[PDB]
Protein backbone atom coordinates (compact mmCIF):
# COMPACT_ATOMS: atom_id res chain seq x y z
CA UNK A 1 0.00 0.00 0.00
CA UNK A 2 1.01 3.47 -0.29
CA UNK A 3 2.34 3.75 3.67
CA UNK A 4 4.06 1.25 5.74
CA UNK A 5 3.23 0.51 9.06
CA UNK A 6 4.91 3.15 10.89
CA UNK A 7 3.66 5.64 8.50
CA UNK A 8 0.26 4.18 8.41
CA UNK A 9 0.30 4.37 12.51
CA UNK A 10 1.26 7.97 12.62
CA UNK A 11 -1.48 8.97 10.10
CA UNK A 12 -3.77 6.79 11.96
CA UNK A 13 -3.07 8.36 15.07
CA UNK A 14 -2.70 12.28 13.58
CA UNK A 15 -6.19 11.59 12.95
CA UNK A 16 -7.82 10.56 15.45
CA UNK A 17 -5.67 13.40 18.00
CA UNK A 18 -7.86 15.76 15.45
CA UNK A 19 -11.11 14.12 16.37
CA UNK A 20 -9.89 14.63 20.49
CA UNK A 21 -8.99 17.73 19.31
CA UNK A 22 -12.28 18.90 17.83
CA UNK A 23 -14.43 17.32 20.14
CA UNK A 24 -13.11 20.08 23.20
CA UNK A 25 -13.32 22.87 20.64
CA UNK A 26 -16.86 22.37 20.46
CA UNK A 27 -17.35 22.66 23.74
CA UNK A 28 -15.32 25.80 24.45
CA UNK A 29 -17.53 27.01 21.74
CA UNK A 30 -20.96 25.89 22.88
CA UNK A 31 -20.71 28.18 26.22
CA UNK A 32 -19.76 30.87 24.52
CA UNK A 33 -22.74 30.41 21.64
CA UNK A 34 -25.17 29.98 24.32
CA UNK A 35 -23.58 32.93 26.73
CA UNK A 36 -22.26 35.55 24.70
CA UNK A 37 -20.52 38.78 25.97
CA UNK A 38 -22.00 42.15 25.08
CA UNK A 39 -20.92 45.51 26.01
CA UNK A 40 -17.31 45.45 27.09
CA UNK A 41 -16.10 48.97 26.01
CA UNK A 42 -17.43 52.13 24.67
CA UNK A 43 -16.57 54.81 21.91
CA UNK A 44 -15.21 57.21 23.86
CA UNK A 45 -12.16 54.96 24.83
CA UNK A 46 -10.65 54.77 21.48
CA UNK A 47 -9.48 57.56 19.22
CA UNK A 48 -10.45 57.18 15.84
CA UNK A 49 -7.35 57.19 13.50
CA UNK A 50 -7.85 56.27 9.93
CA UNK A 51 -9.99 54.30 7.85
CA UNK A 52 -8.52 50.65 7.13
CA UNK A 53 -11.34 49.48 4.79
CA UNK A 54 -14.60 47.16 4.32
CA UNK A 55 -16.45 44.55 6.13
CA UNK A 56 -19.65 43.56 5.26
CA UNK A 57 -22.48 45.94 5.78
CA UNK A 58 -19.84 48.73 7.76
CA UNK A 59 -16.54 50.23 7.34
CA UNK A 60 -13.50 49.12 9.45
CA UNK A 61 -11.24 51.88 11.36
CA UNK A 62 -7.99 52.01 12.97
CA UNK A 63 -8.28 53.05 16.80
CA UNK A 64 -5.98 53.31 19.56
CA UNK A 65 -7.33 52.61 22.77
CA UNK A 66 -6.91 55.48 24.79
CA UNK A 67 -5.81 53.99 28.47
CA UNK A 68 -3.37 51.75 26.71
CA UNK A 69 -2.28 52.93 23.84
CA UNK A 70 -3.41 49.44 22.51
CA UNK A 71 -4.66 49.84 18.19
CA UNK A 72 -7.54 47.62 16.63
CA UNK A 73 -9.82 47.23 13.57
CA UNK A 74 -13.24 48.97 14.76
CA UNK A 75 -15.96 47.71 12.04
CA UNK A 76 -18.96 50.40 12.53
CA UNK A 77 -22.05 49.24 11.46
CA UNK A 78 -25.12 51.64 10.81
CA UNK A 79 -28.31 50.50 12.61
CA UNK A 80 -30.53 52.18 9.72
CA UNK A 81 -28.54 51.13 7.15
CA UNK A 82 -28.26 47.84 8.11
CA UNK A 83 -31.93 47.27 8.69
CA UNK A 84 -32.34 48.93 5.03
CA UNK A 85 -30.45 46.03 3.37
CA UNK A 86 -32.47 43.27 5.72
CA UNK A 87 -29.57 42.52 7.17
CA UNK A 88 -30.14 42.64 10.66
CA UNK A 89 -30.12 39.05 11.83
CA UNK A 90 -26.55 38.60 10.18
CA UNK A 91 -24.81 41.16 11.70
CA UNK A 92 -26.13 39.90 15.04
CA UNK A 93 -25.19 36.82 14.29
CA UNK A 94 -21.48 37.81 13.33
CA UNK A 95 -20.86 39.35 15.98
CA UNK A 96 -22.29 36.10 18.21
CA UNK A 97 -19.87 33.70 15.85
CA UNK A 98 -16.57 36.21 16.55
CA UNK A 99 -17.28 36.23 20.60
CA UNK A 100 -17.36 32.22 20.52
CA UNK A 101 -14.76 30.86 17.86
CA UNK A 102 -11.33 30.66 19.46
CA UNK A 103 -8.20 29.35 16.84
CA UNK A 104 -5.19 31.21 15.37
CA UNK A 105 -5.95 32.07 11.90
CA UNK A 106 -9.66 33.70 12.99
CA UNK A 107 -9.54 37.23 13.98
CA UNK A 108 -10.21 37.75 17.36
CA UNK A 109 -12.89 40.01 18.87
CA UNK A 110 -11.98 42.30 21.49
CA UNK A 111 -14.81 44.31 22.35
CA UNK A 112 -17.92 45.38 21.46
CA UNK A 113 -20.76 47.83 22.11
CA UNK A 114 -23.30 49.81 20.62
CA UNK A 115 -24.90 53.07 20.78
CA UNK A 116 -27.98 54.92 19.51
CA UNK A 117 -26.36 54.90 15.89
CA UNK A 118 -24.49 51.73 15.63
CA UNK A 119 -22.63 48.51 16.24
CA UNK A 120 -19.25 48.51 17.21
CA UNK A 121 -17.04 45.54 16.60
CA UNK A 122 -13.40 45.85 17.62
CA UNK A 123 -11.17 42.91 16.48
CA UNK A 124 -7.53 42.94 16.45
CA UNK A 125 -5.51 44.82 14.15
CA UNK A 126 -3.54 42.56 11.94
CA UNK A 127 -1.48 45.03 10.12
CA UNK A 128 -0.19 43.03 7.17
CA UNK A 129 -2.69 44.23 5.01
CA UNK A 130 -4.60 41.58 2.67
CA UNK A 131 -3.85 38.65 0.66
CA UNK A 132 -5.34 40.54 -2.33
CA UNK A 133 -3.12 43.54 -1.84
CA UNK A 134 -0.09 41.10 -1.70
CA UNK A 135 -1.24 38.74 -4.27
CA UNK A 136 -1.94 41.59 -6.65
CA UNK A 137 1.60 43.32 -6.04
CA UNK A 138 3.87 40.34 -7.25
CA UNK A 139 1.08 38.78 -9.49
CA UNK A 140 1.14 34.84 -8.20
CA UNK A 141 2.53 33.20 -5.87
CA UNK A 142 4.40 30.20 -5.66
CA UNK A 143 2.72 27.14 -5.08
CA UNK A 144 4.78 26.71 -1.60
CA UNK A 145 3.73 29.95 -0.40
CA UNK A 146 0.10 29.75 -1.27
CA UNK A 147 0.26 26.11 -0.09
CA UNK A 148 1.70 27.67 2.91
CA UNK A 149 -1.49 30.03 3.23
CA UNK A 150 -4.08 27.36 1.86
CA UNK A 151 -2.90 25.02 5.18
CA UNK A 152 -4.46 27.65 7.46
CA UNK A 153 -7.92 27.81 5.10
CA UNK A 154 -7.82 24.06 5.42
CA UNK A 155 -7.65 23.98 9.43
CA UNK A 156 -9.48 27.02 9.57
CA UNK A 157 -12.12 25.45 7.97
CA UNK A 158 -11.77 21.67 9.51
CA UNK A 159 -12.55 23.54 13.15
CA UNK A 160 -15.26 25.80 11.47
CA UNK A 161 -17.32 22.69 9.93
CA UNK A 162 -16.51 20.81 13.29
CA UNK A 163 -19.36 23.40 14.58
CA UNK A 164 -21.66 23.35 12.09
CA UNK A 165 -20.45 26.73 10.43
CA UNK A 166 -20.63 27.52 6.86
CA UNK A 167 -17.86 30.70 5.99
CA UNK A 168 -19.49 31.25 2.48
CA UNK A 169 -17.13 33.95 1.68
CA UNK A 170 -13.56 32.93 1.36
CA UNK A 171 -11.46 35.24 -1.29
CA UNK A 172 -8.14 37.00 -0.89
CA UNK A 173 -9.78 40.64 0.25
CA UNK A 174 -11.35 38.71 3.21
CA UNK A 175 -7.62 37.27 4.65
CA UNK A 176 -5.45 39.98 6.07
CA UNK A 177 -1.84 39.22 6.87
CA UNK A 178 -0.28 39.54 10.29
CA UNK A 179 3.18 40.86 11.45
CA UNK A 180 4.25 36.80 11.50
CA UNK A 181 3.39 36.45 8.00
CA UNK A 182 0.47 33.83 8.94
CA UNK A 183 -2.83 34.60 7.83
CA UNK A 184 -6.03 35.63 9.52
CA UNK A 185 -10.05 35.02 8.05
CA UNK A 186 -12.01 38.09 8.66
CA UNK A 187 -15.97 38.83 8.24
CA UNK A 188 -18.09 36.30 9.10
CA UNK A 189 -21.59 38.47 7.61
CA UNK A 190 -22.53 35.48 5.81
CA UNK A 191 -21.55 32.86 7.73
CA UNK A 192 -24.08 30.08 9.01
CA UNK A 193 -24.49 27.54 11.50
CA UNK A 194 -26.66 25.20 10.16
CA UNK A 195 -26.36 21.47 10.28
CA UNK A 196 -27.42 20.03 6.66
CA UNK A 197 -28.52 21.93 4.42
CA UNK A 198 -29.38 25.77 3.16
CA UNK A 199 -30.33 27.55 0.37
CA UNK A 200 -29.05 31.44 0.60
CA UNK A 201 -27.68 32.73 -3.09
CA UNK A 202 -25.02 34.73 -1.30
CA UNK A 203 -21.23 35.04 -1.47
CA UNK A 204 -18.83 36.71 -3.78
CA UNK A 205 -19.88 35.41 -7.94
CA UNK A 206 -16.41 34.11 -8.83
CA UNK A 207 -16.23 32.05 -5.61
CA UNK A 208 -19.71 30.84 -5.74
CA UNK A 209 -20.13 27.15 -6.38
CA UNK A 210 -21.93 26.09 -8.51
CA UNK A 211 -24.81 24.61 -5.87
CA UNK A 212 -25.00 28.19 -4.32
CA UNK A 213 -25.98 29.43 -7.87
CA UNK A 214 -28.39 26.72 -8.89
CA UNK A 215 -31.97 26.78 -6.65
CA UNK A 216 -30.84 23.07 -4.94
CA UNK A 217 -29.84 23.54 -1.86
CA UNK A 218 -26.04 23.38 -0.42
CA UNK A 219 -23.97 22.27 2.63
CA UNK A 220 -20.63 23.23 4.11
CA UNK A 221 -18.97 21.54 0.95
CA UNK A 222 -18.64 24.79 -0.95
CA UNK A 223 -16.28 25.99 1.00
CA UNK A 224 -14.20 23.50 -0.29
CA UNK A 225 -15.36 24.17 -3.62
CA UNK A 226 -14.46 27.99 -2.35
CA UNK A 227 -10.84 26.56 -1.36
CA UNK A 228 -10.48 25.21 -4.54
CA UNK A 229 -10.91 28.84 -6.07
CA UNK A 230 -8.61 30.60 -3.69
CA UNK A 231 -5.96 28.12 -4.23
CA UNK A 232 -6.26 28.62 -7.79
CA UNK A 233 -6.19 32.36 -7.54
CA UNK A 234 -3.45 32.41 -5.31
CA UNK A 235 -1.27 30.24 -7.62
CA UNK A 236 -2.32 31.69 -10.75
CA UNK A 237 -3.28 35.41 -9.95
CA UNK A 238 -6.51 35.61 -11.52
CA UNK A 239 -9.58 32.87 -10.47
CA UNK A 240 -10.78 30.35 -12.39
CA UNK A 241 -13.96 31.73 -13.61
CA UNK A 242 -14.71 35.41 -14.86
CA UNK A 243 -16.27 37.58 -16.69
CA UNK A 244 -17.47 41.06 -16.91
CA UNK A 245 -20.72 40.27 -15.17
CA UNK A 246 -21.75 38.47 -12.18
CA UNK A 247 -24.28 36.73 -14.90
CA UNK A 248 -21.74 35.39 -16.97
CA UNK A 249 -19.17 34.28 -14.48
CA UNK A 250 -21.88 31.74 -13.10
CA UNK A 251 -22.55 30.33 -16.57
CA UNK A 252 -19.10 29.25 -16.99
CA UNK A 253 -19.56 27.91 -13.14
CA UNK A 254 -22.11 25.81 -14.09
CA UNK A 255 -20.28 24.83 -16.85
CA UNK A 256 -17.50 24.07 -14.65
CA UNK A 257 -14.67 23.43 -17.42
CA UNK A 258 -11.66 24.20 -15.57
CA UNK A 259 -8.39 25.29 -17.65
CA UNK A 260 -5.05 25.62 -15.77
CA UNK A 261 -1.78 27.58 -15.84
CA UNK A 262 0.62 25.67 -17.86
CA UNK A 263 3.32 26.41 -14.49
CA UNK A 264 0.42 24.44 -12.62
CA UNK A 265 2.41 21.55 -11.06
CA UNK A 266 0.43 18.35 -11.65
CA UNK A 267 -0.14 17.65 -8.29
CA UNK A 268 -1.98 21.47 -8.19
CA UNK A 269 -3.74 20.93 -11.13
CA UNK A 270 -5.25 17.43 -9.39
CA UNK A 271 -5.85 18.75 -6.23
CA UNK A 272 -7.94 21.57 -7.99
CA UNK A 273 -9.86 19.15 -9.82
CA UNK A 274 -11.04 17.59 -6.90
CA UNK A 275 -12.19 20.42 -5.24
CA UNK A 276 -13.69 22.26 -8.30
CA UNK A 277 -15.90 19.10 -9.06
CA UNK A 278 -19.42 19.70 -9.49
CA UNK A 279 -20.43 16.15 -8.35
CA UNK A 280 -20.75 15.79 -5.24
CA UNK A 281 -20.33 12.60 -4.45
CA UNK A 282 -16.97 13.23 -5.81
CA UNK A 283 -15.63 16.57 -4.10
CA UNK A 284 -13.05 16.47 -1.70
CA UNK A 285 -13.73 17.72 1.80
CA UNK A 286 -17.64 15.72 1.28
CA UNK A 287 -16.28 12.12 1.17
CA UNK A 288 -16.36 9.53 3.71
CA UNK A 289 -12.93 10.62 4.24
CA UNK A 290 -13.97 13.85 5.09
CA UNK A 291 -11.35 16.85 5.12
CA UNK A 292 -8.54 13.98 5.04
CA UNK A 293 -8.64 13.73 1.74
CA UNK A 294 -7.37 16.98 0.82
CA UNK A 295 -5.23 16.84 3.96
CA UNK A 296 -3.74 13.85 2.49
CA UNK A 297 -3.40 14.86 -0.81
CA UNK A 298 0.00 14.95 -2.72
CA UNK A 299 -0.02 18.92 -3.32
CA UNK A 300 0.26 18.81 0.77
CA UNK A 301 2.67 16.29 1.48
CA UNK A 302 5.27 18.83 2.94
CA UNK A 303 2.27 20.23 4.94
CA UNK A 304 3.06 19.79 8.91
CA UNK A 305 0.07 20.18 9.87
CA UNK A 306 0.48 20.33 13.65
CA UNK A 307 3.11 22.66 13.01
CA UNK A 308 1.50 25.14 10.83
CA UNK A 309 -1.35 25.27 14.33
CA UNK A 310 1.62 25.92 16.09
CA UNK A 311 3.02 28.78 14.19
CA UNK A 312 6.26 26.99 14.18
CA UNK A 313 7.14 27.05 10.40
CA UNK A 314 8.47 30.12 8.64
CA UNK A 315 6.17 32.11 6.66
CA UNK A 316 7.15 33.58 3.10
CA UNK A 317 6.63 36.74 3.63
CA UNK A 318 6.92 38.84 6.49
CA UNK A 319 4.98 42.35 6.13
CA UNK A 320 6.95 45.80 6.59
CA UNK A 321 6.08 47.31 10.35
CA UNK A 322 7.05 51.17 10.64
CA UNK A 323 5.86 51.67 14.35
CA UNK A 324 2.32 51.05 16.02
CA UNK A 325 -0.64 52.23 14.46
CA UNK A 326 1.28 52.52 10.71
CA UNK A 327 -1.34 51.69 7.34
CA UNK A 328 1.39 51.24 4.63
CA UNK A 329 0.17 48.03 3.75
CA UNK A 330 -3.31 49.33 3.25
CA UNK A 331 -5.08 51.29 0.62
CA UNK A 332 -6.09 54.31 1.55
CA UNK A 333 -10.35 55.06 1.35
CA UNK A 334 -12.63 57.83 2.25
CA UNK A 335 -12.85 58.70 5.59
CA UNK A 336 -16.43 58.87 6.53
CA UNK A 337 -17.22 61.03 9.96
CA UNK A 338 -18.85 58.81 12.45
CA UNK A 339 -22.11 60.83 13.47
CA UNK A 340 -24.18 59.35 16.91
CA UNK A 341 -27.75 60.66 17.31
CA UNK A 342 -29.50 61.78 19.87
CA UNK A 343 -31.93 59.46 19.45
CA UNK A 344 -32.14 55.36 19.73
CA UNK A 345 -32.21 53.84 16.41
CA UNK A 346 -33.57 50.37 15.94
CA UNK A 347 -33.18 49.53 19.28
CA UNK A 348 -35.49 46.48 19.84
CA UNK A 349 -34.27 44.98 16.64
CA UNK A 350 -30.64 45.12 17.82
CA UNK A 351 -30.84 44.04 21.74
CA UNK A 352 -28.94 41.01 21.70
CA UNK A 353 -25.74 42.98 20.31
CA UNK B 1 -4.53 35.02 -22.79
CA UNK B 2 -6.51 34.00 -20.02
CA UNK B 3 -4.67 36.83 -18.32
CA UNK B 4 -5.17 39.60 -20.81
CA UNK B 5 -8.80 38.50 -20.44
CA UNK B 6 -8.61 38.95 -16.89
CA UNK B 7 -6.99 42.47 -17.01
CA UNK B 8 -10.07 43.04 -19.52
CA UNK B 9 -12.74 41.69 -17.26
CA UNK B 10 -12.92 45.06 -15.16
CA UNK B 11 -12.79 42.69 -11.99
CA UNK B 12 -9.21 42.81 -10.84
CA UNK B 13 -10.19 45.55 -8.17
CA UNK B 14 -11.64 44.16 -4.78
CA UNK B 15 -15.06 42.13 -5.51
CA UNK B 16 -18.13 42.80 -3.27
CA UNK B 17 -19.98 39.85 -2.31
CA UNK B 18 -23.22 39.93 -3.23
CA UNK B 19 -27.11 38.83 -0.81
N1 LIG C 1 -11.65 44.32 2.42
C1 LIG C 1 -11.92 43.42 3.57
C2 LIG C 1 -10.94 43.67 4.70
N2 LIG C 1 -11.14 45.00 5.29
S1 LIG C 1 -10.09 45.60 6.37
O1 LIG C 1 -10.51 46.94 6.63
O2 LIG C 1 -8.78 45.36 5.83
C3 LIG C 1 -10.25 44.69 7.88
C4 LIG C 1 -11.44 44.09 8.14
C5 LIG C 1 -11.65 43.39 9.32
C6 LIG C 1 -10.64 43.28 10.25
C7 LIG C 1 -9.38 43.89 10.02
C8 LIG C 1 -8.30 43.81 10.93
N3 LIG C 1 -7.12 44.38 10.73
C9 LIG C 1 -6.95 45.09 9.61
C10 LIG C 1 -7.91 45.24 8.65
C11 LIG C 1 -9.17 44.63 8.82
Redesign the interface.
Known sequence: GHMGNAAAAKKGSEQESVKEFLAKAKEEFLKKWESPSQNTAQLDHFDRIKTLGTG?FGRVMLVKHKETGNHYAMKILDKQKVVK?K?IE?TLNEKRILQAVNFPFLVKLEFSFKDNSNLYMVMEYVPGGEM?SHL?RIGRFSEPHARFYAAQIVLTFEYLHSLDLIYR?L?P?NLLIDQQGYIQVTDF??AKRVKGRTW???????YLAPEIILSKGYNKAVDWWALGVLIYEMAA??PPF???Q?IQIYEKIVSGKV?F?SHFSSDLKDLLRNLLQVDLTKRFGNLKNGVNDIKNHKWFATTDWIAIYQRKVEAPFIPKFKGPGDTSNFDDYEEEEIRVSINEKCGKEFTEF | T??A??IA????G??????
Open positions: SLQHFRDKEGFTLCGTPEGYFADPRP | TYDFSGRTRRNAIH
